[PDB]
Amino acid sequence: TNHEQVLTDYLAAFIEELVQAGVKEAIISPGSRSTPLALMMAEHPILKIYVDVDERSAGFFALGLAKASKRPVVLLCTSGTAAANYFPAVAEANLSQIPLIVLTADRPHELRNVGAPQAMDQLHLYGSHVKDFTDMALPENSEEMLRYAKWHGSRAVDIAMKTPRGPVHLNFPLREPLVPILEPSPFTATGKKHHHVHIYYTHEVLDDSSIQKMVTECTGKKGVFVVGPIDKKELEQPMVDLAKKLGWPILADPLSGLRSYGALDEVVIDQYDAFLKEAEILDKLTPEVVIRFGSMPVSKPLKNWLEQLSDIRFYVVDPGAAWKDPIKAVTDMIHCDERFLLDIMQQNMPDDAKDAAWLSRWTSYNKVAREIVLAEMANTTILEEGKIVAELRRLLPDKAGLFIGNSMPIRDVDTYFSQIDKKIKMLANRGANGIDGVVSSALGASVVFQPMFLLIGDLSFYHDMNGLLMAKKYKMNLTIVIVNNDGGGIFSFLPQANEPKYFESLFGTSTELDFRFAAAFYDADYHEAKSVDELEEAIDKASYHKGLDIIEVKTNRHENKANHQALWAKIADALKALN
Amino acid sequence: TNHEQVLTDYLAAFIEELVQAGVKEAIISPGSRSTPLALMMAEHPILKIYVDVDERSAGFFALGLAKASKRPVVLLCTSGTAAANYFPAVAEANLSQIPLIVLTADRPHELRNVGAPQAMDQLHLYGSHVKDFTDMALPENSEEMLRYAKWHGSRAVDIAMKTPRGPVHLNFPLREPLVPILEPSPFTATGKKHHHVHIYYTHEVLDDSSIQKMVTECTGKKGVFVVGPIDKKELEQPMVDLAKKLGWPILADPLSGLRSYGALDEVVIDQYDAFLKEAEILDKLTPEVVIRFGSMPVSKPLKNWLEQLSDIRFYVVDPGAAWKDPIKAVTDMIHCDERFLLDIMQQNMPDDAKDAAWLSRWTSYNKVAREIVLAEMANTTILEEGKIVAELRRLLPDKAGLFIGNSMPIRDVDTYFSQIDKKIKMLANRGANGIDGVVSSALGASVVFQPMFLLIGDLSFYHDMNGLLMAKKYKMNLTIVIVNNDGGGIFSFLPQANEPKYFESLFGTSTELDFRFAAAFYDADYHEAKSVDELEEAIDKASYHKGLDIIEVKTNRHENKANHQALWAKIADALKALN
Amino acid sequence: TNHEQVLTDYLAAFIEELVQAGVKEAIISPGSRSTPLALMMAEHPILKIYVDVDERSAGFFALGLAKASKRPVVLLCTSGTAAANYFPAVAEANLSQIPLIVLTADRPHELRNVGAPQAMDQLHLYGSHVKDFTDMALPENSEEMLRYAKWHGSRAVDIAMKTPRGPVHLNFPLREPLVPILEPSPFTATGKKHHHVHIYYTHEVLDDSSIQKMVTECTGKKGVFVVGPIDKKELEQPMVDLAKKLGWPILADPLSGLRSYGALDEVVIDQYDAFLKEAEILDKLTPEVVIRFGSMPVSKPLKNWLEQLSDIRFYVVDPGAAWKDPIKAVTDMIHCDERFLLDIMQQNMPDDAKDAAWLSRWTSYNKVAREIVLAEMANTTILEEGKIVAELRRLLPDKAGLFIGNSMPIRDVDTYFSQIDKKIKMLANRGANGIDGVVSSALGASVVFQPMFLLIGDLSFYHDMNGLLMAKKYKMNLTIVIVNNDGGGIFSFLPQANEPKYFESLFGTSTELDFRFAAAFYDADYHEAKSVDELEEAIDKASYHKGLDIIEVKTNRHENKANHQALWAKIADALKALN
Ligand SMILES: Cc1ncc(C[n+]2csc(CCOP(=O)(O)OP(=O)(O)O)c2C)c(N)n1
Ligand SMILES: Cc1ncc(C[n+]2csc(CCOP(=O)(O)OP(=O)(O)O)c2C)c(N)n1
Ligand SMILES: Cc1ncc(C[n+]2csc(CCOP(=O)(O)OP(=O)(O)O)c2C)c(N)n1
Ligand SMILES: [Mg+2]
Ligand SMILES: [Mg+2]
Ligand SMILES: [Mg+2]
């Protein structure tokens, strides 16, 4: 009894502090060693629990939920290889700056590295892929240890939510017996117990000298904004307003939110991946200033171009000093909040240093290429990869969420998803660009945004098929469009597709999986879209179905390259003739 | 020749970027594998070089120089155990937030973990004791690799200087031949080469909602400032002004600069370590708000007291989110720049919510205890430990630097160094409180502050005796006062001094070293102070000697406890009788 | 009392098991957090204690003691940077396979990574430089925890003594109070307590098929033994006997023991470093089989030669699978005990497959070069570096220990120390070849071997001058010969000595230290040897002095290269003319 009471007081002070620090959800995996942490978080009247038996799927589920809500999400698993399954989501959360509080149970010291069953060295388990690691003490209920448990609870959340955000790992060695005292409840009916650690909201700010320096050096310059994947509060309207004020184009990634923030503007460029391939056009586009926001864009033609830009002022806005610059072209590094920098320029830059011909050159190429793409997709009935993205852009409701898988789906959105006057929250795992856990990440984001849709390739869908168990047992609403080209279509473009001897076994891995059976395994409505009218009917059915939908579109891998190169050629020819 | 030219271009782009990022000094240790980095930094016309053959002493030398100048200092050593000798200074720089750029040469990949001579695994050599680690590529002079070398040069300094500051480690695998091309020079006479990465000055700022919350909750409260070891720009006058505006006492550590910033004030409390021992007095001192600045103070009576303060608002100002709170008593954590918080309250707090009786209670106990200490030291001729500190407080010139060793010297400054109207820059290694490398740290700080003095115990002086070689070969000016009590006097107070069986062998380690010979080994003027007049004459001689001075004062270890407890009792008796 | 009794039972079970596992000595550094471990090891009636206040010197002291006695030696230090000072000795013990049991005290969990005084992250402190790491639990005296403490005590020693031997690290978080119960004694007067874990002696053995394979492929081959630094039991006579049986030369490093095992033989080659420089001679020396023992030899001419040997069978004997092969020339890797392989060939190889002309070619070049060196040193009166080694070879008593420093001293022994019919145990730190801690390592080895001598350069002597404090307080007997060339003489041979602009500041670091004062600081008899007769008289005085002796010989750095190249030329000319 004394042992169980110590175990209860120790974890109650830690769990209550997680809730008071802003944790609302906890994704738990079943286990015997994690029993005291799992039971008490379920007993907590505010913490919402999601139980996932696949630890790999559970990690990405919590990852998507945190990525969509900007909220710190708790993960719990038992000792052993269950904690090793968190590594893909932890590495992705570290490179994408997602606040995951990873709690892993462990054997006590007497059962560590002694060959005990379900025992594993978990000290610094994730290496440098967490912002901080803590090996908690064995449960003690003394005054200093109860305040030590609350201290680490507030510290874990604060370090995870501190810019640059990222995952934190806490290891809990737990000694048997493992059943705490839940009656009476350890969170409620405990008077004179509140001792919350309030954390104040802070943000980084440029000096007055730094502000004057950049305002002076950016006035009257032919500048270009490059906004890659970035998910901060708002920021979509302030970026457009500053670009209108300066007359600068915004090379906007699909994941920047600028292609679908609810309105149309004349500064967002969404065809750069297309026309930056043309050499005869880059002459008139050479800028003097480049100001980067967020991560690096998916566009590889946007890369290379920025890589060869010589004798320019290349600003990079990096609030956390993460130093994400894969081209190493940075000339001026800025470590301040993006919202602050946008406002501080909005009311300091001159209101009339706008070379109209500069923005006219970018918007001309962009709007001409934009309509050639929309023309080729409107006049086709073959449901090619680009057509799937085009019809999604047309059929998605306002205030809808769209999770985009890596590989071809994210690159096809960059090519075939122009700016539209609807609010579409777009997410993707762009830390390591892994095809793993995409289904769970979308399901976690479906807790926040509704209606939620997922554009994903076939290989990636198989990878995290287990995620769908969360959709089945929690009655979740998600519409999954599978671009089943039966293998890896990303490898038809890369130069390995010309050697046919070992292709289709090392790269284009054919699966021949009938996803209709997988849709039945997870209680999902299945539709095979063979025509444009069928794909429509399926999407319209998915809105009237509050549940899991799967819309498979079989495409041809060996025809993608020709379709994309035919479109890119028609764009280059038209833009070459422009004066 | 092509190999040597590649080696020259690669390192020149890296070294020039370190200089342009603010590096002015480089402490180098001799070695064959570090040849190309050592020769090129010496060839650089701006980088100043200090050569130290003891790598342990070299690390602490650079540590003191960075700690005194707020400048990022480069360390260079060769492959092998030479890099292992950096670990004490690196661990101290990490816990004390000092920007050290640790560069360690290494064997190329073909000579790594193959039993090669002077080869050692140096990947993540310092573990979590560096903010970042980089294993540089083998030298390449391609366009991308030359920009990669400059990129890491600017990144290393920026990450090290970014709050919370700390050391960074870069490993350089270097392949033979190792002699670069210095004629013509690779830094000058190289046109169209400037591509510096300018970093802008940023700082953290509280939100408007956070400012309003704290101003409201601190108005009219019986608050107390606790300023431990902190070395930021200025901050000494703003703290006193805010405390005068609010009527709050400042429990000021010696290393906070508030005991010697050039003026006298009526809010700094420098006797708390004395009177917080008395139980009958703490009744009238119980506060409602505690606002902490800097690290944790050396005073252990200031600890315990703050540890048992219940039902208070315990603010902790932590610009880097380092979470330094060994008592875990934090109620409100603040992650903003200290200067910003001081100003934002200076002009938001009410100018008239001052309970005069509150500050009167603290200053009464402080000024009475302050004069009892000064009376006991003025009326004594025995050169006890407290008397040495007292006479230093009287004889030090204005705008002088005083490095204080750990163990008893730092605690005797806290007891016997009241606030004085002189500007005395006080430093100490308070990250891990190691008695190692204190001499080198003082010598590094002597490059910045002059005249420089060092109060150090005998065991600590022996520990880093090799540091004095830097003073001999570089004609450095430092006056070292050795409190030779022949062992560890810190262990006479702790409860291990009552068992005499194994004492004097495990704790009070007698050395019987005649430091007169050590002073001759390093070309230093030696003085043995036996009386107060002799200690004076020696200090006055040290100012007229531009060089190294060593003033030894032999004290009795077994009489320290009685002297300190007699003084503390006379203070407690007087303050008990106060109404 | 209950807390102190738990602390006593916990550590007593651990310390007693270290003693029963073969630990006889413990090198302790003073500290407050290490109080319970330090007091109890002193209380133990079998464990011998050495107290060293320099943790860096303490590590190398224990390193030398373990390297000389083949016994596992315990290190103890307090929490903080004191444990960081162990890193050079730990890295050297890992690369040289020395069984060090590194015990570091630590703060309890509530004081870990919270900014506590003298606190430092010590989890995996030494990274990959230890064979194993253990973070011990807080003291508990339950039945399972007392057996857990004994378990780790037996496991630490066993893992450290297991081939390949190496250091192990155990971290002890200790909570106050820290004073255990020593009266009554916790080791004696404790009936029904013996539960020792006996470890049986095991060794690796080749299969019958592996034995038949190598005996067949080595019969009648022109083979060569290469024995680098190796310190196993005996092995000196078995190697010579097998080489006599096969007719194979033994290219023997000075640290192989084959140049001074008590007798003269006709198979040990000690001039290879000299004559392998000559190109016209290597023609007749090309072998078919190379069998390597121990580490890689210091000779760089022995390197390169073995590196370009093509189409040979290069065997490497590696009992621990450490894979020490810096030339990567291995063709047949053998993971068995050296003694077993020597015997198994001694009685399986044919007794008559000896090409007399093969061994005659090696011994001819060796004996001619050997006498040219001895002639040049016998006919000179200038006390050059080679002459110092020559006179040491003549004046050292039988059954004497000689510690050799790195840099030039070890290379001068390889050149000027021919095989002699005296038993001279030669040691050196050849893991990383660091010039640090050489004095302490020699002093630790002086506990085992007597009389002990140390040949060391001036820079290396200064590096670990603090080691001499152990000689002063423990009345140790060691005769130190300092080859003071006032800087780094190793850099006059390397190709950096032709650029005089930055030489003598980066490589030849002149110190101008009068080591006579350092000898007085440590109560040592000092002699300056200016002639050959003076160096003799000093050595003869050192045998009649039971204590610390220091014999300084000032040499010229800028004349070493010419002296060595003149000798090497006279050898090459004579050996070129040989038929
Ligand atoms: C976890 C993971 N495994 C492997 C890869 C390598 N990879 C990149 S794209 C790709 C093909 C994925 O195919 P699919 O999801 O069907 O996309 P599409 O066919 O539309 O290109 C693979 C295996 C990866 N990025 N992440
Ligand atoms: C590197 C290091 N080793 C050991 C310790 C443990 N320690 C703390 S205080 C102390 C005594 C130092 O003695 P000294 O410098 O002479 O001071 P005083 O006698 O004035 O107390 C020791 C060994 C430490 N803090 N750092
Ligand atoms: C700890 C360490 N620091 C630096 C080096 C680089 N190093 C190799 S040899 C040498 C010179 C040492 O000089 P000394 O001991 O006087 O030898 P000698 O002059 O006889 O060559 C140095 C600094 C090293 N091997 N180990
Ligand atoms: Mg696919
Ligand atoms: Mg002392
Ligand atoms: Mg020398």
Author numbering:
A (entry chain A), B (entry chain A), C (entry chain A): 2 to 580
What do the study's own words say?
The ThDP-dependent enzyme 2-succinyl-5-enolpyruvyl-6-hydroxy-3-cyclohexene-1-carboxylate (SEPHCHC) synthase (MenD) catalyses the first irreversible step in bacterial classical menaquinone biosynthesis via a series of reactions involving covalent ThDP-bound intermediates. An important player in menaquinone production is the thiamine diphosphate (ThDP)-dependent decarboxylase MenD [2-succinyl-5-enolpyruvyl-6-hydroxy-3-cyclohexene-1-carboxylate (SEPHCHC) synthase]. MenD catalyses the first irreversible step of the classical menaquinone-biosynthesis pathway via two covalent ThDP intermediates; decarboxylation of 2-oxoglutarate produces intermediate I, with subsequent addition of isochorismate generating intermediate II and breakdown to release SEPHCHC. Analysis of the structures revealed that LmoMenD adopts the typical three-domain ThDP-dependent fold observed for MenD orthologs, while a combination of structure, size-exclusion chromatography, mass photometry and small-angle X-ray scattering analysis showed that the enzyme has a homotetrameric quaternary structure.
